[PDB]
Ligand binder design. Structure first.
Ligand SMILES: C[S@@+](CC[C@H](N)C(=O)[O-])C[C@H]1O[C@@H](n2cnc3c(N)ncnc32)[C@H](O)[C@@H]1O
Length: 430
């Protein structure tokens, strides 16, 4: 039971990609006439639109700059053959670089991983076109905000995808995350050691201490959380400080859990989006705070990232980031192999400060929190060693041994001053 606010958001999603351009040819697949007309009125006289009411009709649409599909795939999401027919027809109908905006409510779908499974399917699907392949490039998954605020529904999704050419092996950044470090089994094993809802050292108590280093925060202020993981940090920021928190993560595995949990527990201060924080188009001058907890070691282009954060902060706004970093000790081969397998792009505090100054941040604070990181590992390790019997009731031996040796290994990395745990904070001037 949606309102006109939804259709306006769909067009906003479209404009993240095409910007100020108006699309020459638009297709609309939308079975609900009132929702369909609200969409149509969003376009002006420079746009010609063809729309249809059943998915089989996409074969009749072509040379589209954009295809908007709204609540039309109820059957397809339960039938891979029908889904395949739609994706194929959708790709054929679009020009290269054409945008697909797909809105589908998943709240009546009992499978909680459905959004994640659909996203990989879209990301992986390939269609022969000419002497190569075509497919959809992933941009984002957003929540329909009307659905959150009016219907307490956090599982109403909008995918933003773009048609691109592909060769006829080569893994996207998102898939590396979902297939390697942040798998489901990895997530539940990680959550167990760090603490409920957290994938970062020290769990609830530690995250609260870090949030406090922002200084005074007020109810209703807006925070962007980069690399929100399974949501523990965002949810705590909202419940403890009354912040409105928007969390982003590139890993669908991670966010599936965050989304499931907020959808069940219900807190309208918290929303989530799947996207790459180095690329996604955030609204400028809009956030009071940007927070990132142990995320940015995954991110190569720190320079780009900082300019985007700066851009996104309100003047006078504050950024606070913690991250894995590299120390000033002689790097060991074990540490170097560890970094490559994780694909971390590590920096030291000096480099972070240089970049922050170059970006234009003021009041820069940096801290080496490695001694704290050490206390946490030791404390965490004493817990597992004590609760050995309880772990094997839930997970396998293989997950367990990797934890003991991993914890053993990080301790040596800290000892050699290879591995650091860094704190950075700063403010946007004015
Ligand atoms: C070690 S975890 C931290 C989770 C969260 N900070 C917490 O305390 O529970 C890293 C998270 O950052 C996310 N991440 C890595 N690169 C990202 C990117 N380019 N954009 C958005 N999120 C990213 C990963 O998906 C992962 O979920």
């Amino acid at each position: 039971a949606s309102m006109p606010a939804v259709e306006r958001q769909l067009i906003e999603c479209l404009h993240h990609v095409i910007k100020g351009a108006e699309p020459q040819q638009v297709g609309i697949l939308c079975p609900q006439d009132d929702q369909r007309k609200a969409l149509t009125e969003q376009f002006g006289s420079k746009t010609a639109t063809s729309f249809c009411k059943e998915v089989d009709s996409l074969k009749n649409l072509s040379n589209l700059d954009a295809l908007i599909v709204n609540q039309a795939l109820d059957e397809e999401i339960n039938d891979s053959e029908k889904l395949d027919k739609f994706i194929t027809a959708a790709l054929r109908s679009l020009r290269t670089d054409g945008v697909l905006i797909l809105r589908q409510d998943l709240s009546k779908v009992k499978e909680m991983k459905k959004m994640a499974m659909l996203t990989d399917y879209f990301d992986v699907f390939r269609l022969e076109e000419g002497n190569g392949n075509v497919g959809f490039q992933f941009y984002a998954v957003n929540e329909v905000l009307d659905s959150v605020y009016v219907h307490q529904n956090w599982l109403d999704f909008i995918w933003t995808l773009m048609k691109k050419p592909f060769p006829k092996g080569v893994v996207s950044f998102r898939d590396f995350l979902d297939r390697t470090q942040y798998t489901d089994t990895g997530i539940f094993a990680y959550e167990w050691i760090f603490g409920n809802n957290f994938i970062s050292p020290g769990g609830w108590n530690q995250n609260l201490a870090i949030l406090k280093r922002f200084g005074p925060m007020k109810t209703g202020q807006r925070m962007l959380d980069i690399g929100v993981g399974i949501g523990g940090g965002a949810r705590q920021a909202a419940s403890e400080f009354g912040l409105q928190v928007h969390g982003v993560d590139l890993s669908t595995n991670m966010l599936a859990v965050a989304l499931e949990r907020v959808h069940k527990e219900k807190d309208a201060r918290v929303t989530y989006a799947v996207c790459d924080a180095c690329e996604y188009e955030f609204e400028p001058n809009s956030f009071d705070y940007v927070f990132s907890r142990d995320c940015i070691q995954h991110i190569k282009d720190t320079d780009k990232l900082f300019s985007r954060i700066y851009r996104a902060l309100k003047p006078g706004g504050k950024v606070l980031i913690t991250m894995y970093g590299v120390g000033h000790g002689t790097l060991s081969e074990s540490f170097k192999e560890y970094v490559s397998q994780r694909q971390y792009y590590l920096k030291n505090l000096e480099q972070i400060e240089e970049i922050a100054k170059k970006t234009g941040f003021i009041d820069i604070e940096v801290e080496n929190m490695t001694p704290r990181f050490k206390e946490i590992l030791l404390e965490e390790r004493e817990r597992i060693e004590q609760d050995k019997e309880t772990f094997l009731a839930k997970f396998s031996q293989n997950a367990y041994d990797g934890l003991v040796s991993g914890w053993k290994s990080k301790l040596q990395y800290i000892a050699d001053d290879n591995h650091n745990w860094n704190f950075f904070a700063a403010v946007k001037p004015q």
